[PDB]
Design a protein around this motif. Structure first.
Motif: not given
Ligand code: NA
Length: 58
Positions: A1-6, A42-58
């Motif tokens: 599952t892919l996620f998108v930034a809110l 988009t960039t291929g960059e990796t790192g930690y992200i806050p999961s409350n800032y993303v949602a699963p893609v439709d």
């Protein structure tokens, strides 16, 4: 599952990852906690992200 930034997010250190609203990610690890190691489609960059800032893609 892919996620998108809110919302935009600005990294505080080398370990988290900055991103823009609408950026998509593949999720690498999600069971350390609520911060996930992710890779931007988009960039291929990796790192930690806050999961409350993303949602699963439709
Ligand atoms: Na979320």
């Amino acid at each position: 599952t892919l996620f998108v930034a809110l919302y935009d997010y600005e990294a505080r250190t080398e370990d988290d990852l900055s991103f823009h609203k609408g950026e998509k990610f593949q999720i690498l690890n999600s069971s350390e906690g609520d911060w996930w190691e992710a890779r931007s489609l988009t960039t291929g960059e990796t790192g930690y992200i806050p999961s409350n800032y993303v949602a699963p893609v439709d």
